[PDB]
Structures are given as structure tokens and as C-alpha cells.
Ligand binder design. Structure first.
Ligand SMILES: O=C(Cn1ccc2c(=O)[nH]c(NCc3ccccc3)nc21)Nc1ccncc1Cl
Ligand SMILES: O=C(Cn1ccc2c(=O)[nH]c(NCc3ccccc3)nc21)Nc1ccncc1Cl
Ligand SMILES: [Cl-]
Ligand SMILES: [Cl-]
Lengths: 122, 122
């Protein structure tokens, strides 16, 4: 019965990315080797099984700094964080493996599934 | 060049609504007459010119309680908050006027514009 705004979700995500771009209401720093990335936990939780599981745990939910696995590649992480906030995944031959393995670690199964299709599409 | 996930934004919004439903990482209470509504400021800012303007102001950005104009109808507010988090607007003859006037106050111009089309479509 309700009216559907078909661009509203993407508009929200776009604005949330603009907020990240300005460091407005970001509440966590993700450290990946020597790089740091600020983000909104709510967005992370919405997009990643690893961050969902971390922050739903009232023991961890107020963490302000998350140190990721040192083996994780920051470029892979950065590509996935961009994806979270934009719905666009920058998959390329030079990065498919680091992205796929990072998406496995972050428990982003649709992305991993898409990464497999990409290998299969060559 | 990048791969577009066409359902990702709506999936994010759906998960953010589930987080609200569980009061996970909500950081503001909106008081409207005798009713209270918890929400995420980031979502509010993304969807409303009034909340954007309030919370971008470093003077107001850490407010945990916002008292809205007492004349605002809580049902109208509640319909608009649901819309923010779902992209579905529950517009009905019994509520078009309270929704439109609430959307004016919250500076949700596409919604106001849509409310006018609704009156014109009768
Ligand atoms: O679903 C998410 C995060 N997420 C995104 C893709 C994706 C994924 O592929 N596998 C997982 N495995 C862990 C898990 C599985 C089901 C629900 C929750 C977590 N998790 C993912 N978060 C969420 C769920 C329900 N309510 C609010 C929120 Cl924020
Ligand atoms: O646009 C919004 C909020 N919003 C949603 C619909 C809507 C609206 O119809 N009129 C207004 N008038 C005030 C305004 C006008 C332009 C930008 C910002 C505020 N504001 C709206 N927020 C935002 C913008 C840029 N970067 C990050 C964010 Cl969160
Ligand atoms: Cl801030
Ligand atoms: Cl919480």
C-alpha cells in the first residue's frame, strides 16, 4: 500500500559516504597494517559479518579502534570500504585476489561470491 | 569501470533499520510531544535538512536529546522516520496533511514534493 521511493536508499548511502568524507559522526578507526580508516560502525555492521559480530557483542561494541589481521592488505580493505559506502566494487586483475581474500575475512559473502564469478569470467 | 551492486544500498538501509529496531548504536532520542523515538543521527542527517543542519553544527552535534516543535504530530513524525529507514512512505487520506507539514518542518523536500503530487492525484 505504501509509496516506494526507488532512489532513497542510494541517496542515503551517498550522504553517509559524504559524512564519512568529512569525518562527521565516524565512531571507529580501522587499522590495517600501517594505514588507518575512519568509518561508521553502523555501516560496517550493515555490510560485514565480521564487523556485525564484533560490534553486536556488548563487550566490544564501544571499541573505538579495531586492529585488523596484520596479513590483510590495506588496498583490499580500502576497496571493500569504498564498496560498503558506494555499492560499486573496483575489481581488477591486479587486485582480485587481495579483494577476495579480504572479503572472506570480513565475511562479505555476496562479494566473495561475486569475486568467484569474476575469476570464472576470466 | 566498477561493478555495481544494484541491491546493496537497500540492503544497507534494511540492516540499519534492523539495528534501530534493536536499539544498537542509536545515539539520539527525538521527543515529539509525549512520544520518544530513538534513531541514528547519521541516518537522520542523510534524510532531513533539519537534522543535517542541527548535527553538522559542532555546537549541537553531540546532543543526545532533540525536542521537536510541540505542534509537530508524532504520527506524522513516526511515518517520516519509518520512511527514512525503509524508502516506503505510508501516505493516506487520513494523514496526508500531518505528513506534509511534518516533512516541511523536517526539510524533506522530495517528500513534500511527493505529498503535493498526492493531493493533486486526489
Ligand atoms: O548482515 C549483516 C552484515 N552482513 C552483510 C553481509 C553479510 C554476509 O554475507 N554474511 C554475514 N555473516 C554473519 C551474519 C549472518 C546473518 C546475519 C548477521 C550476520 N553477515 C553479513 N548485518 C545485520 C544483520 C541483521 N540485522 C542487522 C545487521 Cl547490521
Ligand atoms: O542532504 C542531506 C539531508 N537532506 C535530505 C533531503 C534534503 C532536502 O530536501 N533539503 C535539505 N536542505 C538543507 C540541505 C541542502 C543541501 C545539502 C544539505 C542540507 N536537506 C536534505 N544531508 C547531506 C548532504 C550532504 N552531505 C551529507 C549529508 Cl548527510
Ligand atoms: Cl563528529
Ligand atoms: Cl548501543
Amino acid at each position: 500500500s505504501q509509496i516506494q521511493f526507488t532512489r532513497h536508499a542510494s541517496d542515503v548511502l551517498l550522504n553517509l559516504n559524504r559524512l564519512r568524507s568529512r569525518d562527521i559522526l565516524t565512531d571507529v578507526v580501522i587499522v590495517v597494517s600501517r594505514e588507518q580508516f575512519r568509518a561508521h560502525k553502523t555501516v560496517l555492521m550493515a555490510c560485514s559479518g565480521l564487523f556485525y559480530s564484533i560490534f553486536t557483542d556488548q563487550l566490544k561494541r564501544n571499541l573505538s579502534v579495531i586492529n585488523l589481521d596484520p596479513e590483510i592488505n590495506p588496498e583490499g580493505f580500502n576497496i571493500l570500504l569504498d564498496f560498503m559506502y558506494t555499492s560499486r566494487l573496483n575489481l581488477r586483475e591486479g587486485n582480485i585476489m587481495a579483494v577476495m581474500a579480504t572479503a572472506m575475512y570480513l565475511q562479505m559473502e555476496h562479494v566473495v561470491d561475486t569475486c568467484r564469478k569474476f575469476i570464472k569470467a576470466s
